[PDB]
Design a protein around this nucleic acid. Structure first.
Ligand SMILES: [Mg+2]
Ligand SMILES: [Mg+2]
Ligand SMILES: [Mg+2]
Ligand SMILES: [Mg+2]
Ligand SMILES: [Mg+2]
Ligand SMILES: [Mg+2]
Ligand SMILES: [Mg+2]
Ligand SMILES: [Mg+2]
Ligand SMILES: [Mg+2]
Ligand SMILES: [Mg+2]
Ligand SMILES: [Mg+2]
Ligand SMILES: [Mg+2]
Ligand SMILES: [Mg+2]
Ligand SMILES: [Mg+2]
Ligand SMILES: [Mg+2]
Ligand SMILES: [Mg+2]
Ligand SMILES: [Mg+2]
Ligand SMILES: [Mg+2]
Ligand SMILES: [Mg+2]
Ligand SMILES: [Mg+2]
Ligand SMILES: [Mg+2]
Ligand SMILES: [Mg+2]
Ligand SMILES: [Mg+2]
Ligand SMILES: [Mg+2]
Ligand SMILES: [Mg+2]
Ligand SMILES: [Mg+2]
Ligand SMILES: [Mg+2]
Ligand SMILES: [Mg+2]
Ligand SMILES: [Mg+2]
Ligand SMILES: [Mg+2]
Ligand SMILES: [Mg+2]
Ligand SMILES: [Mg+2]
Ligand SMILES: [Mg+2]
Ligand SMILES: [Mg+2]
Ligand SMILES: [Mg+2]
Ligand SMILES: [Mg+2]
Ligand SMILES: [Mg+2]
Ligand SMILES: [Mg+2]
Ligand SMILES: [Mg+2]
Ligand SMILES: [Mg+2]
Ligand SMILES: [Mg+2]
Ligand SMILES: [Mg+2]
Ligand SMILES: [Mg+2]
Ligand SMILES: [Zn+2]
Lengths: 181, 23, 69, 69, 117, 84
RNA sequence: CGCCUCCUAAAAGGUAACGGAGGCGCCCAAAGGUCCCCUCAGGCGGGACGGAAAUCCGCCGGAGAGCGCAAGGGUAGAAGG
RNA sequence: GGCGACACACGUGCUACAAUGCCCACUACAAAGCGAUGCCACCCGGCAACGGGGAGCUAAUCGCAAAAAGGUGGGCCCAGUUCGGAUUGGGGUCUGCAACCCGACCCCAUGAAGCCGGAAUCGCUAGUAAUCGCGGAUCAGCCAUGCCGCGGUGAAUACG
RNA sequence: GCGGGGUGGAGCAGCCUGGUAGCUCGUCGGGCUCAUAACCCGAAGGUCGUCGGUUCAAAUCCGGCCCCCGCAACCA
């Protein structure tokens, strides 16, 4: 790997706080991040202008990771939906790339959210993981006004080896996740 | 804008003065 | 990872407005920014910008105790 | 006599060439405590139906009462 | 979304570009160009990031705008609704508040005409 | 709204009734007609009966309703709806 | 009125009636050969638009899914993707 | 308290949809009327509404009073806009016992419908139509965009 | 027993060939008239007889159940 700012912060500042608060008898018992999945829930590319790999360069500049396609499982009438229809993108961030992205998402992007009163302190898995939903995409530093054509939000899956939300709050917290309440 | 109180013109019509029509 | 399908990630420098400098990585080696975590009014302690308004509504109104008894 | 108060309409309008005929009246009718009598309230507001067409709109409600259903 | 929460049109003058923001009429666009020292006749495309940050910093820090404005606005209406006073009762239903007449007109507070048989 | 030069307005045959309960024994039912009176901070927590032309409307008073008059809290037109 | 599935059919097979219920007269150039990989329905929790149900993440879930079409049998230690 | 209600329908208007325009400053040219608990100069305070002053005048005397369009230059460049000003938030100023119902005005923020109007329909033949301001009655204030007047600029067409 | 049918208030399309409901009258608002008809402009109303299945999707394809028309009910 390589030296990145939130990653160093995890090992030498966040970890030990945690070990304090919860007292672990093993260095592996102590919450890690496992992965960060980004999913453009989508479906704006159903029967309409099906090929939006303009979305997939959005995603690819944010993460440096080309995402993958998601296709309609069951066909569905009311969603105008033909099984095997491209209805979205998914990019799976791990390791350095994950750190790099999460870093830029706490340090710049989440404040570039208009009307930000803080992330929801209630979106915890019940099993350690956290999920946020972003409503658009100029949020991210490397994305300008002069690249867009439509506002696409995205779902952020934050995945963690924590067993409870208690230790999930703490961990995300300490890394600098802004919770409203 | 004769209904636009925020002009000389909209203020003349109503016959009032203000910042937008000073005396 | 897979060759020639990924946007290379390079040492980038993101500059904010409040004078803040982040050293992270990106696809764009130099980027400028509106507000961030060293200046954003949620991130900065309790900067209410302009509005500790607050519950001035109501009876701070007073003005005054000018009714006879 | 009836066993539940109703509210009903009577539209006698026949307009097809001057010939005339317009008679319109919406009413509430309810069952009195037996032995009562025939009660008729001119609760017409203003002149929505002119004064002159009210004597003979009782005489029509009154007339058709001579034979129940 | 440069200044404040919404990016402003270039090619147009700044004493109107700054009015393309919720909470900033022409007069707040009058006072925010003397107080930060920038020519009103220059276009958003003909600036410098110096001239950009001064304005952004000033404009955002002085009065309250955007969401927070609308927030407090709805908040004020929500209170007037809550108690609730007539002034705020005319928000519930959605008729004119400032004591108009309703018999005819008021189609702005009441919307498209529901013609009735 | 009124001119601030003159003090805010209260009927004085009511403000008298507001304070005299504050000392003797709070509180009973103040039957009022003065819809014109601005709500005074000394009223808060009281119940005052604003007339509407026909009936005495119970109005309990709180800390978010002060500048408003007792008339805003007892309408006169009774409406329901149209075409129901 | 021929053909397929179930029952009647009496625990091999077969077994009738103008007995009880369905379905076929096609299809697929991949829906075929083989190699390699992958595992479902459903439930709860979480997530911008996004609803009971589109896509994403978690945990539970041996098979209730899927197997072009009826039904039966079979079947993830795959015949399913 | 109501005549100011609001699912709706009709009449009468005002203001608009813009570049023959709209905004800002600089500068001109009317008439008819009104004015002694009334008109209010000018000076000062406030972005202002207005307020504290305070001179004149029973007024071809002093005043309301700037008429407005227009003229000089400069800005916006065809966009739901620097067109539009409805609606709503907050703060105010005055009248008046009192502006919740239910006043008008100021200023700050908001900046809706409306891109020239289906069937149908009005007015006007000349200083008229159109367009622009002014005054008066009532009047504490004002819901007047109404009414009765006044002058500015100033057309088109009538074969029949 | 055999056939056809049931869809805005009336009468008729759509059904065969799954996706999207149509025509004339009537109703309603506005117009014209002194007024009424006629006529002109504009609008609303079915959620396709029901219950069940097929399908991603059912007025539409399939099954049952209520109803209505047509034909049959012979040698006996
Ligand atoms: Mg939770
Ligand atoms: Mg976990
Ligand atoms: Mg005009
Ligand atoms: Mg304007
Ligand atoms: Mg006191
Ligand atoms: Mg006849
Ligand atoms: Mg503005
Ligand atoms: Mg009004
Ligand atoms: Mg056997
Ligand atoms: Mg046997
Ligand atoms: Mg054998
Ligand atoms: Mg048999
Ligand atoms: Mg096969
Ligand atoms: Mg196969
Ligand atoms: Mg193969
Ligand atoms: Mg599942
Ligand atoms: Mg869920
Ligand atoms: Mg979407
Ligand atoms: Mg199965
Ligand atoms: Mg089948
Ligand atoms: Mg009254
Ligand atoms: Mg009246
Ligand atoms: Mg607009
Ligand atoms: Mg529009
Ligand atoms: Mg505008
Ligand atoms: Mg206000
Ligand atoms: Mg009032
Ligand atoms: Mg145009
Ligand atoms: Mg025009
Ligand atoms: Mg003549
Ligand atoms: Mg006038
Ligand atoms: Mg008018
Ligand atoms: Mg039969
Ligand atoms: Mg029918
Ligand atoms: Mg046919
Ligand atoms: Mg068809
Ligand atoms: Mg009609
Ligand atoms: Mg006559
Ligand atoms: Mg007629
Ligand atoms: Mg179905
Ligand atoms: Mg059927
Ligand atoms: Mg027969
Ligand atoms: Mg025979
Ligand atoms: Zn900063």
């Amino acid at each position: 790997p390589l030296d990145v700012a939130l990653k160093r912060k995890y090992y030498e500042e966040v970890r030990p706080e945690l070990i304090r608060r919860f007292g672990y008898q093993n260095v592996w018992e102590v919450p890690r991040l496992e992965k960060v999945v980004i999913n453009q829930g989508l479906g704006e590319a159903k029967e309409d202008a099906r090929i939006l790999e303009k979305a997939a360069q959005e995603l690819a500049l944010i993460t440096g990771q080309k995402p993958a396609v998601t296709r309609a499982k069951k066909s569905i009438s009311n969603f105008k939906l033909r099984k095997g229809m491209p209805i979205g993108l998914r990019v799976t961030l791990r390791r350095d790339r994950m750190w790099i992205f999460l870093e830029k998402l706490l340090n710049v992007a989440l404040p570039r959210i208009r009307d930000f009163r803080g992330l929801n302190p209630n979106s915890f898995d019940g099993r350690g993981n956290y999920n946020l939903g972003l409503r658009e995409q100029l949020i991210f530093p490397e994305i300008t006004y002069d690249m867009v054509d439509a506002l696409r939000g995205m779902d952020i899956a934050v995945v963690t080896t924590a067993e409870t939300d208690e230790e999930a709050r703490a961990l995300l917290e300490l890394l600098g996740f802004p919770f409203r309440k | 804008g004769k209904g636009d109180r925020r002009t000389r013109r909209g203020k003349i019509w109503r016959g009032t003065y203000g910042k937008y029509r000073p005396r | 990872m897979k060759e020639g399908i990924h946007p290379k990630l390079v040492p980038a420098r993101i500059i904010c407005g409040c004078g803040n400098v982040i050293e992270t990585y990106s696809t764009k080696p130099e980027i400028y920014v509106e507000v961030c975590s060293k200046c954003h009014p949620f991130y900065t302690g309790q900067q209410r910008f302009v509005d500790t308004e607050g519950r001035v509504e109501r009876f701070q109104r007073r003005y005054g105790d000018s009714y006879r008894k | 006599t009836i066993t539940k108060p109703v509210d009903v309409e009577g539209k006698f309008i026949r307009q097809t060439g001057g010939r005339g005929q317009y008679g319109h009246v919406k009413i509430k009718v309810e069952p009195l405590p037996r032995g009562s009598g025939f009660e008729f309230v001119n609760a017409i507001v203003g002149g929505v139906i002119p004064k002159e067409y009210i004597p003979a709109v009782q005489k029509g409600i009154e007339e058709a009462m001579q034979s129940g259903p | 979304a440069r200044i404040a929460g919404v990016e402003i049109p270039r090619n147009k003058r700044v004493d109107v570009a700054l009015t393309y923001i919720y909470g900033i009429g022409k007069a707040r666009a009058k006072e925010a160009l003397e107080k930060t020292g920038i020519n009103p006749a220059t276009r958003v495309k003909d600036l410098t990031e110096a001239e950009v940050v001064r304005l952004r910093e000033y404009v955002e820090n002085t009065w309250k705008l955007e969401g927070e404005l609308r927030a407090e606005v709805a908040a004020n209406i929500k209170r007037l609704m809550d108690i609730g006073c007539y002034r705020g009762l005319r928000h519930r239903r959605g008729l004119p508040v400032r004591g108009q007449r309703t018999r005819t007109n008021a189609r702005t507070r009441k919307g498209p005409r529901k013609t009735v048989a | 709204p009124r001119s601030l030069k003159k003090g805010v307005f209260v009927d004085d045959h009511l403000l008298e009734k507001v304070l005299e309960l504050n000392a003797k024994g709070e509180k009973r039912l103040i039957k009022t007609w003065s819809r014109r009176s601005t709500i005074v901070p000394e009223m808060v927590g009281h119940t005052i009966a604003v007339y509407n032309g026909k009936q005495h409307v119970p109005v309990y008073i709180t800390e978010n309703m002060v500048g408003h008059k007792l008339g805003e809290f007892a309408p006169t037109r009774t409406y329901r709806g149209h075409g129901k």
